[PDB]
Structures are given as C-alpha cells and as structure tokens.
Swiss-Prot record, chains A, B:
It comes from Vaccinia virus (strain Western Reserve) (VACV). It is an enzyme of class 3 (hydrolase). Residues 3-29 are annotated as: Dimerization. Its EC number is 3.1.3.-, 3.1.3.48. The keyword Transcription regulation does not apply. The active site is at 112 (phosphocysteine intermediate). GO terms for biological process: symbiont-mediated suppression of host innate immune response; symbiont-mediated suppression of host JAK-STAT cascade via inhibition of STAT1 activity; symbiont-mediated suppression of host type I interferon-mediated signaling pathway. InterPro entries: Dual-sp_phosphatase_cat-dom, Dual_spec_Phospatases, Prot-tyrosine_phosphatase-like, Tyr_Pase_AS, Tyr_Pase_cat, Tyr_Pase_dom, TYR_PHOSPHATASE_DUAL_dom. This is Dual specificity protein phosphatase OPG106.
Length: 170, 170
C-alpha cells in the first residue's frame, strides 16, 4: 500500500509551502536502503548487539570512539554540525563507499550525535547520488520530506541543505 | 537590483524544505500587479482615502459592508476561511475579473479579514492564471514564497493551498 500518481506531487508541494511538523528528535535506527542505516549516537553504541550484522559504522561526530568488544569497522569522518563547515568535500567518497556497501550487502550504520544533520546530510547525498531516473529537484523534495516524515527531523541544518542542493540539483 | 539565474532556484528549494519564518500578520496593503492590491479588513476601511484611485474592492469576508461616502464599487464574494470551503469554484471568474481590471487600469483591492487566506488564495490564483511562461510547479513555489516573504503570511490555510495546486499545477 503506497501512494503513486500525483498524490506524491500534491504531498510534495504542500510540504514545500509550509505543511511541516515541528522537528522531532529521531530515536530508533532507520533502514534507508538494503544495507545502509541512519542513526544517532545511542544507536551506534547499540550497534554491536542489534538485529543487524554491521560490518561498518560511519562515525560523523568529532570524537573517535571504539567498540572494542566488537568486530565492526569504525570509519571516522569528523565533522561539526555548524552553519559554516563544508561537508560537500566528502560527498563523492562517502556515497561511493555506501554504494559499495549496498553492492556487497555489507551493512553500514551512518550516524552523528543527533542522527539528524551530519548523518542525514550524507544519507541524503547517497540517495541523490543513486537517482538516475527522476528530475533532481523533485527527487530532492520527495527524499527530504519522506525522510523527515519518517525520522521526525532530517537535515535541519540550512547550510547542509544548501550544499546538497548545489551538489546535486544546481 | 534583483536575483536571477539559479539563486531563485536555491532560494526556492531551501524555502521548500523548511527555511520559513513563522507567520507574521500582514499590516499594509501590497501592490501585487499594476492595478491589483492585496489587503486585510482595515486596509479596506482605509480604501476610500488612500493614495490609490480604487474603482473596485473585492470583499471576501462574510459580512456585506458599505463605504457610502465613496464611489468604490464593492464586489462581495462571501467565503469562510476554513479547511472545508471550496474556493476553487470562483477561481475562473475572479481571475478573469482581476485581469480585466489590469487591462483597464482599474485599481482593485482584494481583501479578507486577515489579508492572508481567502484574499491571498485569490491573489495566488490570479498570478498562476496569468503565467504562460514558467513551469507551474516552480512558478507556484516562487509566487508562494516571494509573496509570503513580502506579506509575512500568505495562504497559510492548507486546504486553500491544496485547491490552488489542484487547479493550476495538477
């Protein structure tokens, strides 16, 4: 049971003109594609012993943690969640790595502190990168709002949203 | 001094993903085209003695007022600002009347109580109707956000926005 056929279009245009719930902190991990997951700091601590056989965790926070009782490989890309940091510089490599994970069915968790702005930006970028079908402006609006509806908050950082738009739309 | 060339596009996509100021009540009349104006109840009371030579006022509120010391013609279309009323039924005639006004340079004020939802919807409809150039989805997003940025609040009513989208986009 899904919505097809220009209900998505009204959904999108209404969301695009203010029909948006106030930001609600995301709590549980979200499976976004077959092997790619999106979460927050707690979710990463919880990653050793979750239903998923993670091979990788992509740590987007500033601090290099370990999960030493586990065999998960922790990739650290330290970024700040601010309106000045350039996150686009890592777009190509990160989306490339995530697609490799999806090809090899190697589960990977993409997380930040909140699971909203450094991690949601990389998940958005991945989704945009994998779109060969749909007009980017519309794919962008659909992805953004459906992910926000799902998670409660998604790339609330305006500068991160600007960087995705420039990279993948304009 | 204007923004052209894909700054409008980033502006639009950012506004479309949550970059929106909280609704602020509009106070002064807004000239939207050469002879078409948008305002609230006070603005209409003030219409007899304003810098503009109104020939017409389009009263979208429920109550039939008069301005008996004036020669302004008051057209009454009574509508409620609610999430159930069908405003689309008057779209064709209203936009037709407004375009005639613009052709004959006959100044006309479009108002409701707030100057935000019954009146902004008819102004939006007019603008959409007069667009023969731009893709409707994009013209819609541009008009909506630039009018909201200008006025402070514009078609905040979600059902009125749905009706414009259905009429003019889908």
């Amino acid at each position: 049971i899904r919505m097809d056929k220009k209900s998505l279009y009204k959904y999108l245009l209404l969301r695009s003109t203010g029909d948006m719930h106030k930001a609600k902190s995301p709590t549980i991990m979200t499976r976004v594609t077959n092997n790619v997951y999106l979460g927050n700091y707690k979710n990463a601590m919880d990653a050793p012993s979750s239903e998923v056989k993670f091979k990788y965790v992509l740590n987007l926070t500033m601090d290099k943690y370990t999960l030493p009782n586990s065999n998960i490989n922790i990739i650290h890309i330290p970024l700040v969640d601010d309106t000045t940091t350039d996150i686009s510089k890592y777009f190509d490599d990160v989306t490339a790595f995530l697609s490799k994970c999806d090809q090899r069915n190697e589960p990977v968790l993409v997380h930040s502190a909140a699971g909203v702005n450094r991690s949601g930006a990389m998940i958005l970028a991945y989704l945009m990168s994998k779109n060969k079908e749909s007009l980017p402006m519309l794919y962008f609006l659909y992805v953004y709002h459906s992910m926000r509806d799902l998670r409660g908050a998604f790339v609330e950082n305006p500068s991160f949203k600007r960087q995705i738009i420039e990279k993948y739309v304009i």
